[model samples]
Target: KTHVQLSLPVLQVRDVLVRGFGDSVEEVLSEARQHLKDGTCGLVEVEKGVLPQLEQPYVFIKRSDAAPHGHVMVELVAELEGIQYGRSGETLGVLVPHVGEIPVAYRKVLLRK
Candidate 1:
């Protein structure tokens, strides 16, 4: 009923550039969106360091998109430790899954069990 803006991460997987070709940027981007929608891809962190440390291979990070959108409580699933980036230049991290925001929004944010 409402636009309900929600913030989401734009996952930029580690240097997946296959020099010869990569017309799949759109494919990848589309997949990313779908991943968010279908709970496939997610924002994973670890060891108080952002090195994709979590065992969950589906890691992601990059620019974030604000989409208008929860019931949900502020669950500190884990501390967002390590090298975490934001829309632009920003200092931050700690490998954790705790949402000062909506839990559902972030529920799909972090990764692994």
Candidate 2:
């Protein structure tokens, strides 16, 4: 497989920090899971603006192996629209007709605590 290198412009990067602390191990794990899902729960505007125009969206969590326990980092990477490849075997920088704005809709589901 051939790989094409492309530089993507990052629109925004939001970092969420959640602490999972509980009495037992099971409880700790459960709390961690809940926090992971709800990390960006109420971020409406941020999610809407980024999610809709994102050409590539990524969400991942990182865990450290250190003294401080029950600490997890959630990172979200969203990129704006960009050209993928040359169209119709044409070279780059080809002028094309402007297309109308496309509409997108998404359902928002909020889970109560």
Candidate 3:
């Protein structure tokens, strides 16, 4: 397994740390997931004692000019991060909602024709 650093606010880190032990990866990850949902921040990569790399993939959703209140389009794009490996595609149904300078796991798989 690999480790990725996350760029988060002190309070966000503190919020998770304050809850006490049982600090397993699963739990920590769960908190990270929530943070993403709330739009706090993304991941950050940390070296020996240096700081570099910071960004995350974001789910971009916008209302359609030809759709109603319950319809929209979405795209998986790279927002604020290191490399550029994502882009917006043709619009699709539904709407939804990243972080890391750390190398978090993100697999873009489209298995359909």
Candidate 4:
């Protein structure tokens, strides 16, 4: 068998503005779950902020040298806006680092792990 590249990736969370609609938590939760899957951007609202304080339970970080880049992968903020952002008039993943600096990052989420 060949060698496995499983490592844990750690990322830094920046900011997030998402979740909760009018006066319904479930609505927000439902939309939150939906909006979370895809990319949503705007001056929306949020019930929980980032940095982990708001929530108590966090996910587990597994280590496996067999999982390629698994070590450097970390869960941080979540992105909600133009799921596929591009430069000027194009779409690519290379702009991730730069795009976050702009307003495109309504809800930031990292996929380091």
- The C-alpha TM-scores of every prediction are 0.28, 0.20, 0.25, 0.24
Expressed as tens digits, the lDDT of each residue in 1-100 for candidate 2 is 1221111111221321221133443443344334334442222123344433311222212111111122222222211134231112211111111122
Q: Would you give me the overall lDDT of model 2?
A: 0.24
Candidate 2's C-alpha runs over 4 A off are 1-20, 40-113
The candidate, 2 or 4, that scores higher on lDDT is 4
RMSD of each: 12.2, 20.1, 14.1, 14.3
Candidate 2: deviation at residue 45, Å? Answer: 29
The regions of model 1 sitting more than 4 angstroms off are: 1-23, 46-113
Q: Rank the candidates by TM-score, best first.
A: 1, 3, 4, 2
Q: Of models 1 and 4, which has the larger lDDT?
A: 1
Best candidate (score: lDDT): 3
lDDT of 1 by residue, 1-113 (tens): 12222234222223212111112333433444454445433333223433443322122332232211121111111112332222321111111221222223332222111
Residue-level lDDT tens digits of model 4 in 1-113: 12312211112234322212223323333443333234331222222443232222222222222223322222222222222111121111111111122353322222332
Give the candidate order by descending lDDT.
3, 1, 4, 2
Candidate 2 TM-score to native: 0.20
Per-model CA lDDT versus the true structure: 0.27, 0.24, 0.28, 0.25
**TM-score-best of 1 and 3:** 1
lDDT of 1: 0.27
